[PDB]
Symmetry: D2
């Protein structure tokens, strides 16, 4: 009924909303967090990037809820003698949303409690164990209004290898499914849970990414998006 | 390579940029020009509406030019004892473009001379003969940087009948083709000419509509867009 | 409940049903009529190998569809063109009928309510007994006498790009042709009731013929073809 | 240079090649194995009627493709499941091989470099001589002994949604299954060199079998199916 789709193999700032440290490089890579002139990622970085047009997720007249899917390739790399931190996430957020706290909160939250007014749904690729809320192994998590994921799966993170993600949402079943594959390693990971978008999100949202680097020396990473495809469909009744 | 598409059967202001008199009605119709509380169109109206995300039309590094296509249904209706004026157009314009002069200039031009800095490509559905530049019969016209169309075809306009338009641009041949059908009348019209987008338009544009009503009593119309689908593709080299 | 699409920039025999003189060249072109220079009295048809459901008697639903194709009709010097080519919807298993001006679709020029034929013709030869005098695009329903035509300013050897669309909500069949090198364009539209003409399942494809009389001959080459159908279209998406 | 896609929410025989016990029910379901309650020693296969080009020897190009489908495997009380179902790519004209645990695709459990078979199996029965002990999703290349498996927590009568993707630029075949009612998900991935296994043109579809021994039986119903391939994919577009 209403349908939107886009697909980019290279990025440009013109059709993106970039926040904080997010940049588009001369190679057309979406570099969510800061990288210095030496090619090295820096500490206490936070950036977010969204598609410039809002996307309708649900309709309060008809009660319809969109189905959507997104795919993207990302590269998280780590300097020798550091470990990675903190990760990146694909997000659906209110129009006008501004960055929240950095580090392990991923620019999405101000603390680690549930916040029913966060209006945040995200799929996180978390590279740093945060003792107060995370499982110990690195993980893909489904986040609904909290940094404490409603569901996670173990992610065997490998630095500098391109990761291909597919996230799908089927509004008939309310199932959100996230998967990651490393084509060069032939490894694959998947997590799934139900999410009630209509109870969490505004009718219109912005879609895109958030990422942070570690705040403590020895915990840092690049957070580069290399390609992105999104599609959504919302029924109108004809 | 870069791809964008969207399709709406009903409209909402959230993902549109609306200028001047353009509104979205409670029925989700995009009403480009003013209609009063009696359902009657008013004189000296001008409105424009665009998709909120800019669209890349060409790339100055690779030299690639997008191919695109758009379809839409419109309804132009006229009160008894008036004739129609002035028409509507599908447009590609610079990001940030503001309305120009009203009436026969369609909110796109300031006079009827060629302006090499207008950066305007439009397909017009012109319901009012303007003696200084138009063919006498109502017409579909291809407009490049001037209200004086580079090419026109006769359009047998009928008030209040839904018109379905398809406009296509093939960057390999540079051919722009515009067609209109009235499904209820079984009539159809087509016009085609080449346009060099790279020489006329900026690399990024906004896509959408402009419309005006007559400035003189007895020349007035509604200019309602009822549905709109757009798709573009720009090669990146992989 | 049902969607089908395909698009070919180069052809191969494996997924086509080829009839009579229709060949796939080694350069990937679908040459519907014979080339030894084209020859006389040729008939060729070509279809996609999977049947397409266009309507359903249990639900009443009728498909919307669209097809685009590029064709090249060329003519030898000291000859004129004949007879033309058509895009067709036919019953599963259909066999070629009569040659020449009947385009391989009919036995005679009278209406036949058992032909189960819907076609869009690109007619290069004036047949005194049924055609308009100028060369034409026509919508054919169970007869070689088109229900609707438009004038087509045929030019030999120029690539022609066709778009045909059918909207089941309005019953409107629209056919357009452009010559991108010449910047010329043509369009014809009329309603067709598919429910009452075609069987529930059809084969989609092409038919073409050359003239049976010396001096009236042409090539009938299809260079690319896309098709899409939906049964319970986005024309901006399809056209691209 | 070549694209093909279809999507069915309801099935019909007209555009399918059905083999052995495979039927289309009157409610539009593709029941791959026999239901009198499912019965023993059943084998059924079903294919799309048009051949799909997966690679080309003149250009070297290999297709990328994706397929999604919903299936329901159900089991009678006082019975366990067997033997499973698979999505397959096979040579044009392929005929059913042996029943039971060989899923209608092989004669024995040894590697056969002439089977020209690429399959994704949903294996419901532990075959002592080649399978892992838990029920599994497997990638089969010219053998019933999967090159790669993942554990599948099979649950009877629950709709399962499958996505299979092949990326010709990485050679990676990925297969995932979700049970939306249970919120469970499974994934397996491995590289497959299609060029060296399959002929240039293939038929795509399904195979399924029931157990040959009392107490090991199941239905193998496909409820919907979408396929897309491209030969010179957008997974966000396809999945939707
Ligand atoms: C309490 C905690 O999680 N501490 C980790 C620290 O978190 C930051 C901040 O990112 C987080 O949002 C906030 C929540 O209140 O707490 C702190 O301010 O981040 C550092 C890395 O920058 C972690 O330290 C590293 O942890 C690794 C865990 O595997 C490993 O032990 C490293 O050696 C260590 O430096 C804090 O654990
Ligand atoms: C000169 C001219 O075109 N005049 C028509 C007038 O145009 C406006 C304005 O819209 C236009 O952009 C500008 C260009 O310099 O000129 C004028 O300011 O618009 C009116 C209608 O509002 C036309 O009058 C109507 O024309 C009809 C032509 O078929 C018909 O004659 C009507 O009876 C008449 O009122 C001016 O012709
Ligand atoms: C009567 C007529 O149409 N003559 C033209 C001729 O047509 C052929 C054939 O193509 C037609 O299908 C049948 C229908 O009766 O008639 C003739 O046999 O084709 C010639 C070129 O091949 C034209 O010059 C004739 O005018
Ligand atoms: C040896 C074995 O696998 N036994 C199981 C049996 O398998 C069948 C058949 O399905 C296999 O394809 C062939 C391969 O040699 O062996 C047997 O004939 O299936 C039973 C259920 O039908 C299992 O209980 C046996 O364990
Ligand atoms: C994006 O495109 C614009 C052209 O409008 C150009 O000015 C800008 O430098 C581009 N950015 C990058 C990172 O290439
Ligand atoms: C469009 O949607 C928004 C919901 O954010 C609503 O406030 C607004 O009234 C809608 N406009 C129309 C014309 O329906
Ligand atoms: C069609 O495909 C087969 C390979 O399967 C091959 O023999 C033939 O050359 C192909 N035809 C063309 C025109 O490429
Ligand atoms: C398949 O189509 C034919 C009509 O062409 C019909 O006889 C049959 O009922 C259809 N099958 C189903 C399951 O609808
Ligand atoms: Ca963390
Ligand atoms: Ca005018
Ligand atoms: Ca004729
Ligand atoms: Ca087994
Ligand atoms: Mn986490
Ligand atoms: Mn004009
Ligand atoms: Mn004719
Ligand atoms: Mn197995």
């Amino acid at each position: 009924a209403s349908q939107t789709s886009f697909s980019f193999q290279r990025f440009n700032e013109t059709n993106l909303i970039l926040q904080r440290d997010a940049t588009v490089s001369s190679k057309g890579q979406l570099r969510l967090t800061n990288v210095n002139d030496n090619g090295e990622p820096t500490l206490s970085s936070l950036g977010r990037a969204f598609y410039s047009a809002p996307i309708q997720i649900w309709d309060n007249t008809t009660g319809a809820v969109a189905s959507f899917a997104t795919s993207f390739t990302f590269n998280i790399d780590v300097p020798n003698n550091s470990g990675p931190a903190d990760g990146l996430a694909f997000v659906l957020l209110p129009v006008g949303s501004q960055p929240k706290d950095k580090g392990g909160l991923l620019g999405l939250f101000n603390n680690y409690k549930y916040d029913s007014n966060a209006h945040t749904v995200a799929v996180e690729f978390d590279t740093l164990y945060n003792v107060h809320w995370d499982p110990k192994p690195r993980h893909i998590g489904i986040d609904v209004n909290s940094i404490k994921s409603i569901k996670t799966t173990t992610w065997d993170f490998v630095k500098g290898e391109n990761a291909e993600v597919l996230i799908t949402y089927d509004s008939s079943t309310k199932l959100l499914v996230a998967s990651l594959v490393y084509p060069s390693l032939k490894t694959s990971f998947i997590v799934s849970d139900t999410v009630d978008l209509k109870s969490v999100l505004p009718e219109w949202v912005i879609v895109g990414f958030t990422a942070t680097t570690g705040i403590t020396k020895g915990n840092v990473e690049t957070n580069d998006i290399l390609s992105w495809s999104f599609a959504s469909k919302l029924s109108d009744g004809t």
